[PDB]
Write a protein that binds this ligand. Structure first.
Ligand SMILES: OC[C@H]1O[C@@H](O)[C@H](O)[C@@H](O)[C@@H]1O
Length: 453
């Protein structure tokens, strides 16, 4: 069973994680510039001031992509490089960088896939409440339409948002991501404003007859029951409560994007527990129904699963706990579970309308060391990729409309609050010299693309 003709074998990055040049050429301050410049937020006080210096070295990086034989390259645009203040003055030097990057990609036969928002909100917009302020929808819209209109001739695939779960909950509930806010109700407001922002862009692309594909990227976590792993009888309350908990991860974002409503079971529970105001629940349902429009593709970020069970006295917002099955784990503490990719894809196929699917991120963090001969023998990363590739092939064989696969990541980069301590690249980056070293996984992926295209 072969991968389809034209399958987009890719690699992915995000602007804040690789670009550096955080205050060059009139670039405004982002919430991640602010967050990493405050003590106690990032391991080892790492920041994205320099990162992989991709802003200056993009030409050499594109050459590595060509050598690799990528069909596509997924990256994000830094809003603050285009509108330093979020709205108003457009920065010509910002636009010129992405002009040069995109042209270089096109010259090398690589399909650009652009994430419009990958977490780096302008701090000036955060100053007025960021994603919690419904004015953000229009500011985002103007930014998105500017870049789409400028690049639509060279860029066919656009992703409105990457991982709304993180933007909302990690950014505004747990506060482990920028902007570091800790309020569940604010986080739900953010979810809603993201959905409206997304819908507005999809609508404008259709209504203005812009010939591009617009999607959104969600991290999805397939949830499994510890009780079933153990062979016990599953109680009704357990199944119900674990289902609720997994709706927070998955359905809360899939349902509005693909069906035009929020999951009602989740909302009923959140209102009952005074985690969501009854009025807001009704308004959110109505506004999403009014503005809903089906997208052109679904982007899925997949890394691992979760195993859960009922626990009446848990400190989580649902009475559930997590369990840790035996097996292999990455430096992130994430279970290596390729089967979860297959189960997830089949579950999307069976429970949602037909839609093309791209795996916009999948990869693994291992503690790479460079040998004396200047190599990186990341055989565990290779095994991780090989097994997930195989599950993707199996999903295709079972009728999933999978159209691409982007490895996270093209190169080692700043892993947000974990700093540079987590290496996901198929290319090693020595942060002292900015040298790029092709890992063994680079050559494995190169070969894999060659024999599956
Ligand atoms: O946490 C590892 C990776 O998770 C993904 O879901 C995010 O989109 C990436 O930006 C991040 O580097």
């Amino acid at each position: 069973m072969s991968f389809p003709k034209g399958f987009l074998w890719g690699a992915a990055t995000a602007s804040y994680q690789i670009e550096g040049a955080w205050n060059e050429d009139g670039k405004g301050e982002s919430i991640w510039d602010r967050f990493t410049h405050q003590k106690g937020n990032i391991l080892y006080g790492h920041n994205g001031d320099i990162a992989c210096d991709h802003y200056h070295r993009f030409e050499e990086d594109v050459l590595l992509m060509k050598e690799l034989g990528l069909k596509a390259y997924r990256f994000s645009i830094a809003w603050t490089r285009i509108f330093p203040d979020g709205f108003g003055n457009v920065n010509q030097k910002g636009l010129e960088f992405y002009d040069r990057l995109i042209n270089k990609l096109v010259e090398n036969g690589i399909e650009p896939v652009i994430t419009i928002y990958h977490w780096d909100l302008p701090q000036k917009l955060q100053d007025i409440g960021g994603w919690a302020n419904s004015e953000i929808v229009n500011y985002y819209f103007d930014y998105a339409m500017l870049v789409i209109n400028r690049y639509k001739d060279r860029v066919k695939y656009w992703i409105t948002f990457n991982q709304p779960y993180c933007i909302a909950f990690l950014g505004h509930w747990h506060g482990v991501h920028a902007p570091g806010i800790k309020d569940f109700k604010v986080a739900i407001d953010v979810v809603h404003n993201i959905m409206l922002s997304h819908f507005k862009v999809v609508k404008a692309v259709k209504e203005n007859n812009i010939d591009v594909e617009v999607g959104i990227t969600l991290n999805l976590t397939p949830v499994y029951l510890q009780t079933e792993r153990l062979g016990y009888k599953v109680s009704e309350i357990e199944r119900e409560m674990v289902n609720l908990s997994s709706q927070l991860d998955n359905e809360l974002f899939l349902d509005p994007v693909l069906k035009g409503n929020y999951p009602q079971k989740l909302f009923d529970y959140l209102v009952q527990k005074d985690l969501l105001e009854a009025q807001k629940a009704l308004s959110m349902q109505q506004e999403v129904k009014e503005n809903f429009i089906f997208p052109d593709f679904l982007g899925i970020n997949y890394y691992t699963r979760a195993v859960r069970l009922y626990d009446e006295n848990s400190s989580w917002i649902f009475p559930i706990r997590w369990e840790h099955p035996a097996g292999e784990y990455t430096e992130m503490g994430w279970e290596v579970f390729p089967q979860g990719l297959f189960d997830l894809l089949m579950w999307i196929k069976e429970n949602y309308p037909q839609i093309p699917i791209y795996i916009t991120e999948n990869g693994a963090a291992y503690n790479d060391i460079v040998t004396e001969d200047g190599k990186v023998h990341d055989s565990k990363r290779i095994e991780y990729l090989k097994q997930h590739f195989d599950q993707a092939r199996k999903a295709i064989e079972n009728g999933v409309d999978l159209r691409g696969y982007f490895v996270w990541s093209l190169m080692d980069n700043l892993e947000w609050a974990m700093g540079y301590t987590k290496r996901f690249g198929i290319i090693y980056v020595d942060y002292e010299t900015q040298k790029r070293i092709k890992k063994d996984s680079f050559y494995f992926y190169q070969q894999y693309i060659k024999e599956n295209s």
